[PDB]
Structure 1
């Protein structure tokens, strides 16, 4: 099953199959299924092509993988080009929301780097 320019798990239920898309969570997927008039537990394998076309129309009405890539990249680039606090944090690899950094910032700082 190919949707929004990407394949889709065939054996998984419709909800998780759609969540597999970049830009669609459980709630957005449930809304897609409701708008398409399909059960949340119907496997994509047993589905017909018209339902898949409706799902394509709905995901097109919403935003998709490459669109989100571009939006996020452009936002981060605008930030780090303005040189605001958030852009500085982004470029330096440190947390942005204002977390502590004297310890316990591994998600952004990557693994530990011993001093030598």
Structure 2
């Protein structure tokens, strides 16, 4: 979709939302790509065969639409898993004393 060039494709598809080290296996399954594909890859006939396998995935941005509403559903029921989002609470039953900083 908006991937960068001049790097290897096993790390290049990671740059979008929704892919981490599945391009090593799952995108490598459907497409006949290799590991050493730089910017000089000629991935335009290979752009189509990755477009068929990425169309099944929720990855490119649209997963964050469903991820946002899952929190919005969770706070609307007002669950203890959901109040901890709206209140800076670590949510997954953690100790909210001194070393609980990344939620503030």
TM-score w.r.t. structure 2 length? 0.90
Matches within 5 A, 1:3-82: 3=1, 7-26=2-21, 28-30=22-24, 31-82=26-77
Identify, as 1 or 2, the structure richer in helix: 1
2:87 is the alignment partner of 1:104: no
Contact 2:18-2:61 at 8 Å conserved across structures: no
> Aligned-pair RMSD on alpha carbons?
1.3
Unaligned runs of at least 5 residues, structure 2 = none
Q: CA deviation at 1:52?
A: 1.1
Aligned structure 1 segments of 4 or more residues deviating by more than 4 angstroms: none
3-state DSSP class of the match of 1:63? coil
Unaligned runs of at least 5 residues, structure 1 = 110-116
3-state DSSP class of the match of 1:69? helix
